[PDB]
Amino acid sequence: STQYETQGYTINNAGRRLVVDPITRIQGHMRCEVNINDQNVITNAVSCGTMFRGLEIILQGRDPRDAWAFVERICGVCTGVHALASVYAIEDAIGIKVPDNANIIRNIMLATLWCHDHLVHFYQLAGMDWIDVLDALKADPRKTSELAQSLSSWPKSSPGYFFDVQNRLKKFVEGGQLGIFRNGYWGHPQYKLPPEANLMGFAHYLEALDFQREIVKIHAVFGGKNPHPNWIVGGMPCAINIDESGAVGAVNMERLNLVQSIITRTADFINNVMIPDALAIGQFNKPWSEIGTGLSDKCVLSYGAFPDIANDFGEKSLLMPGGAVINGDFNNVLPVDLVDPQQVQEFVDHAWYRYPNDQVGRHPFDGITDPWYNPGDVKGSDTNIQQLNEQERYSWIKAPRWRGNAMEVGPLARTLIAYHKGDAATVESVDRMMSALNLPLSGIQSTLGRILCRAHEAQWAAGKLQYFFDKLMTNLKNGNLATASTEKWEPATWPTECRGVGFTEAPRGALGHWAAIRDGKIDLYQCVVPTTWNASPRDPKGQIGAYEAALMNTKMAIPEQPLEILRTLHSFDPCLACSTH
């Protein structure tokens, strides 16, 4: 056993080893191991992506115009975001500018995704860490109604409704077929909601499971389907026709009316169901404002997103600010450049990949994806990992760093960046939220804060949906219908050699695709994805990533029941297929 110091932490692998494999209520495959000391406090944390597919390899030799369709299948949860990044990268390489309505529609596609993804995460993925579902069976329906009605104007709050929900749950459980609730952590001492709040929360879980299906109708109108809508290099394929013959074959007023209807319903659900639930979780779990800080008070990163000026990816265009903070210096938000080889680099000395020199980091235009499964000594065998060896290679996830620094990405990171760049709406929301909870600003830098920022962001995105739709309708009122630029559709028009970067803010954080084109085909395609940052393994200096840092120093009530580990990891919304691609 060994110990060393990094980033203010003492990493110590003495003591009992606990393994959590599989991590559930995430996308994809993850393993987590920790060591705990004699006070049941985590002194070592090990994040391991347990899947790989090799999209960067598969994309070689494809037509650049086809790339979005392949990379969209990196992930069906954050569906669409990789397609957006791909079309941005290819347009950047070739020198394609899209029409304004295409940019607006893309921004609608991204905002819709943010709404859908954050909603499903809150209820279906993270919710059962906070709500004790079996405890809902002890609630008083009248007190549940009174609680709901004190928190929100949402209509669905009658005592009879909550009694019906409760009775449905009782009948579900009665015969022993507990399904997704089987062998859960119910009764753990960290479940702090009263029975009435558990029943309210469970009712909202069911309402969100129903409602989420409506949100993605917007992707169906503009993109054909969800999951995995369609896109084009040059704009979008959903041609518009409002007032001419054949509008039945295009995006017409009836289609646009459907989109407006969905936007209204989506804002209503998020503002009156999800937002009050999140604030209530905060009110009853205030100690979690001091747990899981990790790198969120040290280093945070956003690339920025939602260009409001078509084809302008600068600071004056991006509605969602970019920037980096390092060394806990939030008074100096630094500019990010995704072409600068000294900024974003990926290390593989602790990952299952080959580089010619694994002690150095590679920028993605120099990136290499050559898989090498080599777990070293793992107390079992190469096909029976009992304990990963974190002194050696232990993950299918590469280790990204920014100027050599380990960063956190995602809703909390973005909120901190926007706050410290002086974005007025963010400063005002964050201050009001922390005031309503009677917590200091520093409480946001926590597992609780990640959850609150995500809910906030779902509200922000639902508002931006209306803003973007109104911009579209304004262009249509002015006779501007264009949705595609095709000047450089044909490969004969392209540079023989070119390269480009496409970037955005996915639900989970900063996303970049780096592409190089030669002789009409993809020569190189490298992705660095938000969970690649957060779930990162160690680098040659031993620096730990966001997940490992956030788990460090955490007290576990019952070592065998990893609820605290699940709470913190789920607060980052891990997407493991994204992370490994």
Partner: protein
């Protein structure tokens, strides 16, 4: 009355097939889970993790040996001794085989579990392999698409529950009900194909009138699925309706049948 036990496992995948399932409008996924099946193991949605999740898995497959349905999303990689997809420290293929041994039947959801899908596209770095090439002694129903249509997934479930039998299948194991006809055999733009009225470049006058997408690379003529009739997201749209040609996503090896924007070569 007890509900039929279902074990849903996940290999190499993007989770589009689970996401599609929860989009179901009729029946709601909620009502499928609450009233029609017993979804007794599913990494994406279940409360238990780690050893508690493995205990559920082992108890269900033992208790209901011979009587549960195995739903499979994604596929097993044969490369690196199977350790491109690791489950409880061992190759995913081992969990697939243990789950398959006790199942009464297997549903292979999506192009991944049916055929291979994106990870199996050239050069197939992980040797991703579809379920029917690994499990050779159980009934397998293929439900292809990337992902399949939500209401097709739920209709197939309700068929099995209501009629207490597997659906009848074509020679590839696809349900005849939804995969018996080509996209192009029920496409609302077929009038334009038959007239030679084609979109030639994006957002041209033809595109604005909903002309046929054959010259833009539409693979509808060689693809079997229900998209042009049942449609997507509760009848809202489908790829062609929103102006992009079918990619061929329900067909074996669609990723490697040339560019999506190259015309279909020998139309049936």
């Amino acid at each position: 009355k007890p509900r039929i036990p279902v074990v849903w496992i996940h290999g190499l995948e993007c989770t589009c097939c689970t996401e599609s399932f929860i989009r179901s409008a009729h029946p709601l996924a909620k009502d499928v889970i609450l009233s029609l099946i017993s979804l007794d193991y599913d990494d994406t949605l279940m409360a238990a993790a780690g050893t508690q999740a493995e205990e559920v898995f082992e108890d269900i497959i033992t208790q209901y040996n011979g009587k549960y349905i195995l739903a499979v999303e994604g596929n097993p990689p044969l490369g690196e001794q199977g350790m491109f997809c690791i489950s409880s420290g061992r190759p995913f293929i081992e969990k697939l085989k243990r789950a398959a041994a006790g199942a009464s039947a297997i549903i292979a959801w999506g192009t991944c579990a049916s055929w291979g899908c994106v990870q199996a596209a050239r050069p197939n770095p992980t040797q991703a392999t579809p379920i029917d090439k690994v499990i050779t002694d159980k009934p397998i129903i293929k439900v292809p698409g990337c992902p399949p249509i939500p209401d097709v997934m739920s209709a197939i479930i309700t068929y099995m529950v209501t009629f207490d039998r597997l659906p009848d299948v074509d020679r590839m194991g696809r349900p005849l009900m939804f995969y018996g006809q080509r996209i192009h055999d029920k496409c609302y733009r077929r009038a334009h194909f038959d007239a030679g009225e084609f979109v030639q470049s994006w957002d041209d006058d033809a595109a604005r009138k909903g002309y046929c997408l054959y010259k833009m690379g539409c693979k509808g003529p060689t693809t079997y699925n229900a998209c042009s009739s049942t449609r997507w997201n509760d009848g809202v749209s489908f790829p062609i309706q929103s102006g992009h040609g079918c990619l061929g996503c329900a067909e074996n090896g669609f990723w490697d049948r040339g560019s999506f924007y190259s015309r279909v070569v020998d139309i049936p």
